[PDB]
Amino acid sequence: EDAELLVTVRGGRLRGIRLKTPGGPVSAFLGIPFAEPPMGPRRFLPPEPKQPWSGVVDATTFQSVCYQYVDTLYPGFEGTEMWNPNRELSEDCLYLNVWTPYPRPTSPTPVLVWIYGGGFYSGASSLDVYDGRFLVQAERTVLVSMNYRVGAFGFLALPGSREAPGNVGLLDQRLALQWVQENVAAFGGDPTSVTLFGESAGAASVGMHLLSPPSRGLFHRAVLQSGAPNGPWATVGMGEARRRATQLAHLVGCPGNDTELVACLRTRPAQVLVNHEWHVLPQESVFRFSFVPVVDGDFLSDTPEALINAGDFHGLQVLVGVVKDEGSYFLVYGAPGFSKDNESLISRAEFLAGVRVGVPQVSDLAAEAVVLHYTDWLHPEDPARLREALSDVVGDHNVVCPVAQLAGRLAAQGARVYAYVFEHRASTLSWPLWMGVPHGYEIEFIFGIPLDPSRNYTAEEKIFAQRLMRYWANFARTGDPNEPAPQWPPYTAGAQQYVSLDLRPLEVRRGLRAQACAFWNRFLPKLLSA
Amino acid sequence: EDAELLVTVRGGRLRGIRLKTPGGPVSAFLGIPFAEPPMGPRRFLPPEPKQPWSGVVDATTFQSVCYQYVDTLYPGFEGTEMWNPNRELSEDCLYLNVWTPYPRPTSPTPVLVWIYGGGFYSGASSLDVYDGRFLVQAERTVLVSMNYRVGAFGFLALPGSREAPGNVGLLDQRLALQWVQENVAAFGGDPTSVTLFGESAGAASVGMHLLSPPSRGLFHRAVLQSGAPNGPWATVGMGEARRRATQLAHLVGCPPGGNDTELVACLRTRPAQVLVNHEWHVLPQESVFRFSFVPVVDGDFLSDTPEALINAGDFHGLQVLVGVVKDEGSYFLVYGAPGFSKDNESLISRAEFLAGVRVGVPQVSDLAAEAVVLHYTDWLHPEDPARLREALSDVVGDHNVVCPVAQLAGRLAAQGARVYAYVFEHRASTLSWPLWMGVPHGYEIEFIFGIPLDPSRNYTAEEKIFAQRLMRYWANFARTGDPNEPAPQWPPYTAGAQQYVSLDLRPLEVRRGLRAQACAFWNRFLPKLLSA
Ligand SMILES: *[C@@H]1O[C@H](CO[C@@H]2O[C@@H](C)[C@@H](O)[C@@H](O)[C@@H]2O)[C@@H](O[C@@H]2O[C@H](CO)[C@@H](O)[C@H](O)[C@H]2NC(C)=O)[C@H](O)[C@H]1NC(C)=O
Ligand SMILES: *[C@@H]1O[C@H](CO[C@@H]2O[C@@H](C)[C@@H](O)[C@@H](O)[C@@H]2O)[C@@H](O[C@@H]2O[C@H](CO)[C@@H](O)[C@H](O)[C@H]2NC(C)=O)[C@H](O)[C@H]1NC(C)=O
Ligand SMILES: *[C@@H]1O[C@H](CO[C@@H]2O[C@@H](C)[C@@H](O)[C@@H](O)[C@@H]2O)[C@@H](O[C@@H]2O[C@H](CO)[C@@H](O)[C@H](O)[C@H]2NC(C)=O)[C@H](O)[C@H]1NC(C)=O
Ligand SMILES: NC(=O)c1cc[n+](COC[n+]2ccccc2/C=N/O)cc1
Ligand SMILES: NC(=O)c1cc[n+](COC[n+]2ccccc2/C=N/O)cc1
Ligand SMILES: *[C@@H]1O[C@H](CO)[C@@H](O)[C@H](O)[C@H]1NC(C)=O
Ligand SMILES: *[C@@H]1O[C@H](CO)[C@@H](O)[C@H](O)[C@H]1NC(C)=O
Ligand SMILES: *[P@](=O)(/N=C(\C)N(CC)CC)OCC
Ligand SMILES: CCO[P@@H](=O)/N=C(\C)N(CC)CC
C-alpha cells in the first residue's frame, strides 16, 4: 500500500485515493464522516460528532448527496444537469472531502473550505464543477468541502422547539469547520490559515458564519461569490418559519404540540417532505426558497443587516463579487414569457407581471417604484430592453445590491474588501446567448475545470482559469489577491472600486450599480417601514 | 386729428397714438378701461364691465400697475428691476392695450392676447419686455394685453363668500377676453381667430381658461411658456385659501374669523400697502416657488382640479404650443435656497442640497423628500458641489415647471389636440444674471416680443435674426395653428414620440422626451406615494 494515502484523524484511520491531474498527482480523501448520520430520531436535530471507529474507513469516493429536490425543467440539458445530484440521495450524508498535494505537505499549508450553493434546498460537494484537484495541484493548498443538510432537513424551524430548532444545516457546516481545526493538520493543512469561500447560498452561509461568534473563530478569511447573508432570500423570521413548518406538516398528513408535530414528521419518508417543500411558499415567485436560515437570536442574534451595520470588522479581509448577468438564469423558472429556447422578448405586460414574481410579497407602491426605476420612459415597451430590465430587477434585488451593501459596510467598518465582476462567457456555455454570463458560471474557472483535458475550453480560457486560481489562492495565503502588472485595489465605500475579470487584463471600475442599488439599499427600506 | 388713431368701441370713443418702430409705424391704444375700478367697496369682487362714456378717451399711455409687492433682493440690478412695476401702483388698474398695424388692416387679422406672469402676486402689461409694437410691425398681427389684479386683491378667497369669492383676477382676464370678442373688429382684428399666450403664472392662467368653459369660447388657440395650470404652485384648495385669507386679516387686525361679510368689510378699510406688507407671512412654510394668493379650486371657475380636468377633457379642434427654457429652476434658488447667490458660483454642500430640497419641494412627507434625494443624487459623486448645484436647479425646475408642462402636453395630444413643444436654449448676450444659471426662467420672452429689434439695446445681429425667427413661429401658429411656413420642420408632440425642438441660433433640432426619466417620477410615482 501507500503511506501517502493513509491518514489517521482523531476518529480513526482513513484510506484515500491518488488522483490524476494534467500537472501531476494529488491526494484526495473523499467521504470522510464528520457527523453521526442524522436519521430517524435525529432528523431535524443538530449534528452530533462522529463517534470513533476501529479499522480503516474507505475514503476513496464521494458519499451520498443529502436528500433534495431534483430539477426537471430541461431534462438532460447540460446547463441544469450539472447542478443535479450525481450520487444516490440519503439522509446519511454528513461527509466531507479533503484534497491535498501528492506527496502530502511537510510544512503547514493554507486551507480552503468550500460551501456549495443551491438555494438552501439543493447542492452537493460531489458535483464535477466543484472538483478540487486542479486548484490543489496548481496552487499547493489544502481543499476541504462538506455536505450539509438542505431543504426541510437542514432548515425546518419550529422556533423555540428543541425537536426542530432550525439552522442545523448551518450547524453541519460549523461542525465540519470544527473538524478542520482538529484534523486538517493530519493532512498538512494549517489550521491557523483557513479561508472560507462559497457561492450563492454558500456565499450566504459564509457570511452567516462571519456574523456568528462561535463560527468566527474557525476561519480567518472569507470569499463570497454572488451571494450575501443580507439577501432578501437568505433568512426568514421566526413567525414565517413556524408557518411554513406547520403547513408542510399539514401537506403530508401531520398531525398541537411541537413535540407531536415533529414526531409525526419524523415518520415520513424523506422523499415525501421533498415533494411538498415548495407548496408552502406564500406566493408564486422566482428566487425565493421555503426552508432557509431563521433569525432566532441563537445562531444569528439579530438580522444579518443589523449585525453588519453594528459589527467591528477590523482585521478581516474579504473577497466578494458577482457575475455580469445575475438575473438571467432565474427568469426561465417562472417569469412569464421566458425560456432558454428563444430570445424571450417579453411584452410590457409580461415585464410588469415578472416584476411581481421577482420582487414578491411587497406592497403595490413598492412594486411600482421598481417599475419607475427600471423603465426607460423613452422606450417603455421595447421587448429587448424589457427583457434585460427584468433581469436587472431580479439580479440587483437578489444578488448585486445585497453584496454591494455588505462590501460597503464591511469596508467602512475595518475590513479590507476586494470586489470583482466576472464578465467572461465560457465558450462551452450551453445557455442561450441572451443570458450573457449567467449566475454560477464563474465557479468552473475558479476550480480550474478548463484545465481538464477532457473538455473543449480554449487556450486563452485555460490561462484565464490559472489567473483566477492565482487570485483566489493569493487571497487565501495573504488576504491580498495581488502578487508582488495591473493591480487590484481594495473596494471602499467612497471610491467603490472593483475589477473586471475576463480574458483581458484587469480593468478598474467604479460602482457596483450605485444608482440601482441606492434604490434597493437606501430608499425602498424606508418605503416599507412607512 | 388722424382718423386711423380714432376707434369707437361699444363703450365710447378712443384716441390712440402712432408708434414708431424700426420697421415702420404701429397704432397703439394703451390704457383702455375695460372694467370699473375695483376700489373701496369693490375690492375683492368680480369686475364689473366699464360703463359707457361720453367724449373721447385718450388711450395714449400705459395705465397704473395693479397693487403689488416690489422685489428688493438685488436693488438696482437689471435682471430683477425689469420685472418690477414701471408705473405707479394703484387699485385703479383694470386697463388693456391694443397694438395694430398702421394703417389699420383692411381685412380681419388674427389676434394675439398676452397674459403676463409673476407668481399671481406681481407683473404688469406695461413692462418694457412686453412691448407689442415689434410683433405687430414684423408679423401684421393685432396684439392685446391686459392688466389683472394680483396678490390678495386678485386672489384672496373666502370660498363660498359673496364679498370675497376668489379668482377675481382670473375674471379680470376673462372680462378682457369678452372685451376682445366684442371690440377687436373695430381695430381690424378677427374675433374668430384669437390666440391666447402667456408665461409662468400667465401660462398657468392660459391653461385655466382652457379648462373653464365660459372662457374656452373666447379664444381658439393657446400658447403656454414655462407654466401650466397643474403645477403644484398654481392653485390651492378651498380650505387652505380660507386659512391664508383669515390669517392675513388677523395679521392686519380684522376682526378686532366669524362673519365673512364683516371680515372682508374690515379688510377693505385697510390701506393697499398694508395688505401687501403682510401677504407673505401667511405661507405655511419657508419655500421658493410658493405664492400666498393664487387661483382656488372652488367648483366655479374650475369645476375640479386642473389635473382632473386635463385628464377628463376632450381637446379635439384645439392647437397648443408649449415649452420651457433650458434651466427653469436656477432663477428661484437665489430667493431662499441655502448657499445660493447670483454674486458667486453657489457651489453648495451636501447638507445645503438636502436643506434646499425641502425648500424647493415644500410640505411633502419625509418619505417623499427621500425619494427626491434618491433620483437626483449621483451616488458615485454624491457630494460634488457643482453636480449638487445643477441637481437642485433641476429639482425645482422639474417639480414646478417642466414636469407639469410635460404632463399637460402629453394628455392634450392623446386626447385630440395638436401639440407643438420647444426648449429655449439661447442665453442672451445681454443677460445680467450669472452664467451658472444658464438660460433662466423667463428670458425667452424678450425674443418672442422682438425686443432685440429695439435700436437702443445691444443685441447682436444674430440675436435679431433669431427674434425674427421666433416671431414668425408664434405668428404662424396664431394664424394657422402650425408654426411651420411651408426649411427644417417642427413635428407635433405626441405621447409616444414626445418630440420637441430646440430654439437657439442654430437651425431647428428635433429631440425626444421632456426630461422623461425625471418627469415620470414627478408625474407617475410620487402622486401615489403621497396617496399612501
Ligand atoms: C419563447 O418561449 C416562451 C416559452 O414557451 C415555451 O417554450 C417555447 C420554446 C415553446 O416550446 C412553447 O410551446 C413553450 O410553452 C414563450 O412564452 C410563453 O410562456 C407562457 C408562460 O411562461 C405560456 O403561457 C405561453 O403559451 C408562451 N407563449 C407561447 C407558447 O407562444 C414565448 O412566447 C416565446 N417567445 C416568442 C414566441 O417570441
Ligand atoms: C353676517 O353679516 C351680514 C351683514 O351684517 C350687517 O352688518 C353688520 C355690521 C351688522 O352689525 C348688522 O348691522 C347687519 O346684519 C348679515 O347679512 C345682513 O342681514 C341683515 C338681515 O338679515 C340685513 O339687514 C343686512 O343688510 C345683511 N347684510 C348683508 C347681506 O351684507 C348676515 O346675516 C350675517 N351672517 C350671520 C350668520 O349672522
Ligand atoms: C455665496 O453667496 C452666498 C450668499 O451670501 C450672500 O451673498 C454673498 C455674495 C456675500 O455677499 C454674502 O456676504 C451674502 O450674505 C453665501 O451664503 C451665505 O454665507 C454667509 C457667510 O459667508 C452666511 O452668513 C449667510 O447666511 C449665507 N446665506 C445663505 C443664503 O446661505 C455663500 O457662502 C457664498 N459662497 C462662498 C462664500 O463660497
Ligand atoms: N421540493 C420542490 O417541490 C421544489 C420545487 C422547486 N424547487 C426550486 O425551484 C426550481 N428552481 C430551480 C432553480 C432556480 C429556480 C427555480 C425555481 N424558481 O421559481 C425546489 C423544490
Ligand atoms: N408680500 C410680500 O411680502 C412678498 C414677499 C416676497 N414675494 C416674492 O418673494 C420673492 N420671490 C421672487 C421670485 C420668485 C420667488 C420669490 C419668492 N418665493 O418664496 C412676494 C410678496
Ligand atoms: C468537444 O467537442 C466534441 C465535438 O465532436 C464533442 O463531441 C465533445 O462532447 C465536446 N466535449 C465536451 C462538450 O466536453
Ligand atoms: C449699448 O452699448 C452702448 C455702448 O456703451 C451703451 O452706450 C448703451 O447704453 C448700451 N445700451 C443699453 C445698455 O441698453
Ligand atoms: P412666474 O410667474 N414668472 C416669473 C418668476 N417671472 C416672469 C414675470 C420673473 C422671471 O413665477 C413662477 C410661477
Ligand atoms: C440564492 C439562490 O442561488 P444559489 O443557491 N446557486 C444556484 C441557484 N446555482 C445554480 C446555478 C449554483 C449552485
XYZ file of C-alpha atoms in Angstrom, chain A residues 9-412:
404
model
C -7.698 11.565 12.218
C -8.956 11.814 15.789
C -11.831 9.447 14.991
C -9.840 6.668 13.355
C -7.981 5.600 10.232
C -8.718 6.614 6.639
C -7.550 5.345 3.252
C -7.506 7.810 0.365
C -7.051 7.700 -3.396
C -4.396 9.116 -5.713
C -5.972 11.292 -8.413
C -4.608 12.284 -11.816
C -4.135 15.916 -12.883
C -2.546 17.307 -16.073
C 0.252 18.657 -13.867
C 0.951 15.743 -11.555
C -0.963 13.730 -8.969
C -2.927 14.898 -5.943
C -4.206 13.001 -2.912
C -7.939 13.005 -2.195
C -9.782 11.685 0.863
C -13.461 11.600 -0.116
C -16.450 10.676 2.012
C -14.942 11.257 5.464
C -17.705 11.010 8.115
C -17.634 14.061 10.373
C -21.062 13.594 11.979
C -23.321 10.827 13.179
C -25.925 10.096 10.466
C -28.905 12.371 11.210
C -31.571 9.744 10.535
C -34.672 8.547 12.333
C -34.917 10.299 15.697
C -32.035 12.588 14.669
C -33.923 14.199 11.786
C -34.091 17.999 12.289
C -31.672 17.753 15.220
C -28.291 19.481 15.464
C -25.414 17.318 14.231
C -23.595 15.013 16.606
C -19.824 14.499 16.234
C -18.814 11.242 14.572
C -18.057 8.506 17.080
C -14.608 6.870 16.843
C -14.381 3.857 14.543
C -11.976 0.945 14.573
C -10.311 -0.272 11.424
C -9.878 1.642 8.186
C -12.694 3.769 6.782
C -12.643 3.815 2.979
C -12.195 7.433 1.857
C -11.955 6.579 -1.825
C -15.106 8.025 -3.429
C -17.787 10.645 -2.855
C -20.565 9.720 -0.441
C -24.309 10.247 -0.876
C -25.996 13.594 -1.537
C -28.316 14.907 1.198
C -31.990 14.489 0.219
C -33.064 17.299 -2.115
C -35.354 18.231 -4.977
C -34.020 17.388 -8.451
C -34.588 19.982 -11.168
C -36.646 18.675 -14.097
C -37.308 21.829 -16.147
C -34.944 20.924 -19.019
C -34.291 17.174 -18.656
C -30.895 16.115 -19.975
C -29.867 19.724 -20.619
C -26.255 20.220 -19.547
C -26.898 23.685 -18.119
C -29.165 22.291 -15.401
C -27.943 18.693 -15.028
C -24.521 19.927 -13.866
C -26.210 21.155 -10.657
C -28.227 17.996 -10.115
C -27.182 15.258 -7.665
C -24.614 12.918 -9.205
C -24.848 10.443 -6.307
C -27.545 8.499 -4.502
C -29.805 10.508 -2.212
C -29.779 9.735 1.505
C -30.120 11.364 4.885
C -26.848 9.567 5.749
C -24.977 12.329 4.060
C -22.788 14.249 6.578
C -19.395 13.574 4.984
C -16.586 15.885 3.888
C -13.722 15.698 1.397
C -10.038 16.648 1.618
C -7.755 17.320 -1.354
C -4.023 17.685 -0.708
C -0.850 17.696 -2.817
C 0.995 14.454 -3.547
C 3.110 13.812 -1.611
C 1.390 15.449 1.368
C 2.940 18.745 2.521
C 5.752 18.653 5.061
C 5.109 22.235 6.249
C 1.652 23.578 7.164
C -0.334 24.602 4.087
C -3.183 27.140 3.739
C -6.628 25.536 3.785
C -9.599 26.466 1.585
C -13.052 25.328 2.733
C -15.858 25.348 0.155
C -19.568 25.688 0.979
C -21.714 24.872 -2.042
C -24.825 26.773 -3.080
C -28.265 25.686 -4.188
C -30.847 27.960 -2.577
C -30.548 26.048 0.727
C -32.657 23.311 -0.912
C -30.078 21.581 -3.142
C -26.366 21.220 -3.820
C -23.685 18.617 -3.216
C -19.930 18.587 -2.667
C -19.565 15.818 -5.290
C -20.516 17.861 -8.371
C -17.975 17.760 -11.194
C -17.790 21.570 -11.118
C -16.500 21.537 -7.514
C -13.601 19.169 -8.287
C -10.723 20.459 -6.171
C -7.921 18.505 -7.853
C -6.830 21.320 -10.177
C -6.757 24.031 -7.503
C -4.735 21.866 -5.116
C -2.193 20.905 -7.784
C -1.875 24.367 -9.319
C -1.697 26.415 -6.115
C -0.434 23.939 -3.468
C -3.211 24.389 -0.927
C -5.434 22.022 1.039
C -9.041 21.967 -0.183
C -11.943 20.887 2.032
C -15.622 20.690 1.110
C -18.508 19.314 3.142
C -22.071 18.201 2.586
C -24.688 19.912 4.733
C -28.385 19.169 5.073
C -30.603 21.229 2.763
C -34.330 21.841 2.360
C -36.568 20.932 5.268
C -33.931 18.507 6.583
C -31.486 21.338 7.236
C -33.638 24.392 7.892
C -37.137 23.416 9.040
C -37.668 25.520 12.154
C -40.285 25.454 14.854
C -38.649 28.339 16.757
C -38.326 27.744 20.476
C -38.693 23.995 19.993
C -35.921 21.537 20.724
C -37.002 18.789 18.308
C -36.824 21.337 15.457
C -34.629 24.312 16.413
C -33.699 25.218 12.830
C -30.389 26.190 11.218
C -28.972 22.700 11.790
C -27.711 22.692 8.207
C -25.598 25.665 9.248
C -24.502 23.701 12.312
C -23.427 20.935 9.921
C -21.106 23.476 8.298
C -19.793 24.637 11.680
C -19.137 21.075 12.855
C -17.126 20.477 9.681
C -15.213 23.681 10.428
C -14.518 22.313 13.911
C -13.463 19.055 12.241
C -10.978 21.016 10.128
C -9.449 22.740 13.155
C -8.950 19.386 14.891
C -7.838 17.258 11.926
C -6.560 19.294 8.968
C -3.005 19.219 10.339
C -3.012 15.441 9.803
C -3.174 16.233 6.060
C -0.575 19.019 6.115
C -3.096 21.844 6.307
C -2.525 24.867 8.517
C -5.500 25.295 10.902
C -4.352 28.894 11.515
C -4.947 29.920 7.865
C -8.443 28.685 6.966
C -10.250 30.596 4.202
C -13.984 30.046 3.778
C -15.383 30.509 0.304
C -18.784 29.766 -1.178
C -21.107 30.718 -4.000
C -24.772 31.801 -3.999
C -26.438 30.277 -0.907
C -22.969 29.025 0.006
C -21.755 32.624 -0.046
C -24.725 33.483 2.177
C -23.652 30.720 4.562
C -20.089 32.067 4.515
C -21.459 35.463 5.514
C -23.556 33.941 8.283
C -20.520 32.243 9.817
C -18.855 35.673 9.802
C -21.727 37.117 11.868
C -21.939 34.196 14.337
C -19.237 34.345 17.056
C -18.883 30.556 17.545
C -18.092 30.078 13.847
C -15.988 33.249 13.632
C -13.122 31.584 15.486
C -12.896 28.707 12.993
C -11.602 30.586 9.930
C -9.617 33.684 9.061
C -10.710 34.911 5.620
C -13.899 34.713 3.583
C -14.854 34.782 -0.100
C -18.474 35.439 -1.100
C -19.307 34.794 -4.766
C -22.713 36.071 -5.945
C -24.346 35.759 -2.538
C -24.709 37.500 0.786
C -26.358 36.797 4.157
C -28.362 40.046 3.930
C -30.165 38.912 0.775
C -33.974 39.011 0.895
C -33.996 35.226 0.271
C -31.322 34.060 2.739
C -33.119 34.449 6.086
C -36.666 34.122 7.382
C -38.382 35.344 10.523
C -39.465 33.132 13.388
C -43.155 33.665 12.651
C -42.878 32.818 8.962
C -40.609 29.842 9.643
C -43.206 28.373 12.007
C -45.990 28.977 9.482
C -44.014 27.192 6.760
C -43.067 24.288 9.032
C -46.687 23.880 10.138
C -48.079 23.844 6.597
C -45.531 21.274 5.439
C -46.852 19.044 8.220
C -50.428 19.594 7.053
C -49.416 18.868 3.455
C -48.099 15.411 4.441
C -50.722 14.376 6.997
C -49.448 15.639 10.360
C -50.741 15.729 12.947
C -50.889 20.964 18.716
C -47.580 20.105 20.419
C -44.349 20.940 18.633
C -43.283 17.581 20.076
C -46.102 15.722 18.317
C -45.714 17.720 15.095
C -42.042 16.821 14.616
C -42.624 13.251 15.812
C -45.160 12.702 13.028
C -42.859 14.458 10.552
C -40.037 12.087 11.512
C -42.190 9.127 10.412
C -42.495 10.407 6.847
C -40.069 9.097 4.205
C -37.567 11.735 3.153
C -38.854 11.836 -0.430
C -42.296 12.814 0.894
C -41.053 16.012 2.536
C -39.139 16.867 -0.648
C -42.278 16.581 -2.792
C -44.217 19.115 -0.684
C -41.499 21.564 0.399
C -42.265 24.080 -2.361
C -46.036 24.284 -1.819
C -45.513 26.228 1.441
C -44.208 29.362 -0.286
C -46.677 32.230 0.277
C -46.954 33.247 -3.392
C -45.692 32.404 -6.857
C -42.101 33.564 -7.001
C -38.704 33.392 -8.597
C -35.695 33.459 -6.250
C -37.483 32.502 -3.017
C -36.973 29.319 -1.015
C -39.050 27.548 1.600
C -36.611 26.470 4.319
C -33.767 28.949 4.814
C -31.762 30.062 7.884
C -34.001 31.540 10.582
C -33.289 34.611 12.721
C -33.957 33.269 16.220
C -31.393 35.019 18.433
C -29.182 31.908 18.594
C -27.004 31.311 15.527
C -27.887 34.871 14.456
C -28.531 37.140 17.439
C -30.141 39.626 15.029
C -30.893 40.029 11.342
C -27.838 39.880 9.052
C -28.432 43.534 8.142
C -28.374 44.574 11.806
C -25.242 42.563 12.619
C -23.475 44.003 9.564
C -24.327 47.599 10.490
C -23.149 47.114 14.098
C -20.034 44.997 13.580
C -16.355 45.818 14.020
C -14.618 44.160 11.076
C -11.026 45.282 11.579
C -8.523 42.531 10.890
C -10.851 40.848 8.377
C -10.055 40.576 4.668
C -12.850 39.533 2.307
C -13.208 38.852 -1.413
C -16.659 39.474 -2.905
C -18.038 39.614 -6.421
C -20.834 38.940 -8.883
C -21.233 37.796 -12.472
C -22.338 40.236 -15.169
C -25.941 38.989 -15.593
C -27.049 37.647 -12.214
C -30.761 37.634 -13.057
C -30.778 35.870 -16.426
C -30.701 32.322 -15.029
C -33.714 32.618 -12.715
C -36.142 34.051 -15.282
C -36.705 30.727 -17.069
C -38.163 29.360 -13.825
C -41.497 31.177 -13.715
C -41.148 34.642 -15.215
C -43.901 34.822 -17.873
C -42.618 34.767 -21.437
C -39.140 33.476 -20.550
C -37.449 30.351 -21.892
C -33.933 29.284 -22.802
C -35.173 28.079 -26.208
C -35.800 31.504 -27.753
C -34.913 35.148 -27.120
C -37.728 35.666 -24.562
C -38.530 39.114 -25.925
C -41.310 39.829 -23.426
C -44.074 42.429 -23.612
C -44.729 45.333 -21.259
C -47.471 43.236 -19.650
C -45.086 40.324 -19.074
C -42.460 42.750 -17.749
C -44.887 44.124 -15.156
C -46.078 40.574 -14.498
C -42.472 39.477 -13.997
C -41.772 42.289 -11.530
C -44.340 40.907 -9.081
C -42.668 37.487 -9.381
C -39.071 38.670 -9.000
C -39.950 41.026 -6.131
C -42.588 39.030 -4.224
C -44.561 39.882 -1.093
C -44.240 43.671 -1.349
C -46.846 46.416 -1.494
C -48.215 47.848 -4.731
C -46.484 51.174 -4.076
C -43.214 49.279 -3.627
C -43.770 47.309 -6.833
C -44.248 50.416 -8.908
C -41.232 52.241 -7.500
C -39.412 49.306 -9.115
C -41.285 49.811 -12.383
C -40.420 53.509 -12.258
C -36.682 52.980 -11.770
C -36.282 50.161 -14.319
C -38.429 51.668 -17.092
C -36.842 53.661 -19.905
C -39.661 56.132 -20.495
C -38.361 56.906 -23.986
C -38.751 53.202 -24.912
C -41.285 51.897 -22.377
C -42.371 48.881 -24.468
C -39.164 47.795 -26.231
C -39.139 43.984 -25.784
C -35.345 43.594 -25.748
C -34.944 46.416 -23.217
C -37.691 44.937 -21.034
C -36.036 41.513 -21.052
C -32.777 42.989 -19.778
C -34.595 45.291 -17.347
C -36.398 42.389 -15.668
C -33.095 40.514 -15.427
C -31.613 43.626 -13.811
C -34.589 43.712 -11.432
C -34.011 40.119 -10.340
C -30.223 40.400 -10.264
C -29.986 43.728 -8.439
C -32.661 42.936 -5.853
C -31.398 39.452 -5.004
C -27.611 39.436 -5.522
C -25.827 42.570 -6.708
C -27.214 45.081 -4.229
C -27.123 42.851 -1.124
C -23.471 42.143 -1.972
C -22.772 45.835 -2.621
C -24.286 46.778 0.744
C -22.167 44.151 2.510
C -18.983 45.334 0.787
C -19.676 48.968 1.652
C -20.476 48.349 5.313
C -17.581 45.944 5.926
C -15.124 48.305 4.218
C -16.352 51.306 6.216
